[model samples]
Target chain A: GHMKLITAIVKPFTLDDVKTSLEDAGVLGMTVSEIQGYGRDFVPKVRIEVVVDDSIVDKVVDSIVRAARTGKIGDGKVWVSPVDTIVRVRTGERGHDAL
Target chain B: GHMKLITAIVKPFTLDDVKTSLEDAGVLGMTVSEIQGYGRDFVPKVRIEVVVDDSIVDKVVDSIVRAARTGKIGDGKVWVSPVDTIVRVRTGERGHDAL
Candidate 1:
């Protein structure tokens, strides 16, 4: 089956909470990076992406929102999209295992 | 009601053109990062995501493809998906304003 790619942009400081929540929700690995949101003057942001099975997509999104939300503005954005394919270089594993 | 998220993986050097093109297209903000593409020799690639109004989605994608295209392999791929919501933390602006 194809994997879903979950991408989120959140406050830089919220990284810790988001990370912990994802781990608790059974997310194994994710990629995080520093980014800028220029809407309201250049604001610093964190971009996070994780690839997971379709079954866990909603759970993962909820975990991130719950942990990252501040009920205020700039809580960031989260999105999920189809990932055509994934492959692990070392083990040559594809699909879920590669993820 | 929502913004479209356009994500692309392009050659590192192509970023300047991509950025300029987006800016010229009236896209005020975007998030970009350095990522590794394992498909062809673990090549280094630039990942860029921009939130824009639905009307301009096609234009933005066109600009990127025009600038990032290389006849050879690994020219990169671009995809667009739905963005549930966006928030501008600094100004407490949500939706398109946040973008």
Candidate 2:
């Protein structure tokens, strides 16, 4: 089966907290990015992403949601999608093996 | 068929200029995030993404690269991949239709 890529666009300052929180939840790897603008709800955002097996989507999303909450402005949105294919360029792994 | 999702992690200050260039090039929408990084060259980066029909990838990348270049450290790298399935969650659209 393919993995699910969880992308969260949240406030910038919350990054370290979320990173720590995700690691505490047993997530070993994630990609964190700072992003701006244009959410459906109009919030400026910083983006964080975790790519894991589909089975963990809910858990990972929950952890990010928990760590990202500030009840403040510019906190972003989260989107989950099925990854039919994935690539690890450095290792040249593709598809399910990419993870 | 799906689409191509082009992602670039570049310099923060270059964003507005890059956005303007992409807009002028007729890229309707893109998702951008600020991200600190560990890249092969070991530079900090800002991330931007454009999800469009596969046919448009080269054009999109060219536009971003031209706009994002500063001949300085921190101008990031761009990567392209085939998107197997794409969804516009807010709009409830999927596949090629998502764009």
Candidate 3:
């Protein structure tokens, strides 16, 4: 099955709300990290990644936006791309099950 | 040329091995972070991201897999996806050169 990888760079303070929103939206799993980047200026941001079933892609993106929005210039950015394959190392699970 | 973004989640302890392997495999740069996930249970993991040429995608994945495999559950997992664009902030370089 095709999966979409959604990456969002958002203000650090919003991580908690974003996490809760994603969990409520049925995201199976996600990876998060604190990273530095330059846009209008260099700053610290939280990068969150989630690989999900293609069918629910829109819903997931909306959840992130809703939770992370701050109505400011550096509120953050989100993008989606095509994931070729996925695997779960614990049980050798692959595809949607791995997510 | 196209670029593939390789994302791997492995045991935290294996991060050094994976980083060394990727450098030896000709990876120009990468991002590493601590992450947590659910499989059999909640566990700590290391997530590494690399943007590389499409031609060497398999080589990159192999290096990570080889270095991270522990022959046991929770050894790790690796996946790749298409990255439409990649930009280097310091110099504003784009595409393969940016990678």
Pairing residues by index, what is the TM-score of model 2?
A: 0.57
Question: Candidate 2, residues B1-99: lDDT per residue as tens digits?
Answer: 447778888887788887888778777556765568654446556678777787778888988898888886566789987654444433434455545
RMSD of 1: 5.5
- Model 2 segments more than 4 A misplaced: A6-34, A39-42, A45-99, B37-44
TM-score for the A-chain in each candidate structure: 0.91, 0.77, 0.92
Per-model TM-score on C-alpha atoms: 0.63, 0.57, 0.71
What's the lDDT of the predicted structure labeled candidate 1? 0.78
Which candidate number has the best lDDT?
3
Clashing pairs in 2: A33-B34, A34-B33, A34-B34, A34-B35, A35-B32, A35-B33, A35-B34, B10-B46
Give the alpha carbon lDDT tens digit for every residue of B37-74 in model 1.
Answer: 85458898888888888989998999999999877678
lDDT score of residue A65 within candidate 1 = 75
Docking quality tier of candidate 3?
A: acceptable
Judged by TM-score, which candidate is best? Answer: 3
What RMSD, rounded to one decimal, does every model reach?
5.5, 6.8, 4.4
* Docking category of candidate 1: acceptable
- State the lDDT of candidate 3 residue by residue for B1-99, as single tens digits: 378888899988888998899888778788887876654435788889999888898777877877887777667678888788989999999997697
Find the 10 residues in a row with the least total lDDT in model 3 chain B: B33-42
Off by over 4 Å in 1: B1-4, B7-29, B32-48, B52-54, B62-99
Better of 2 and 3 by DockQ: 3
DockQ of each: 0.27, 0.14, 0.47
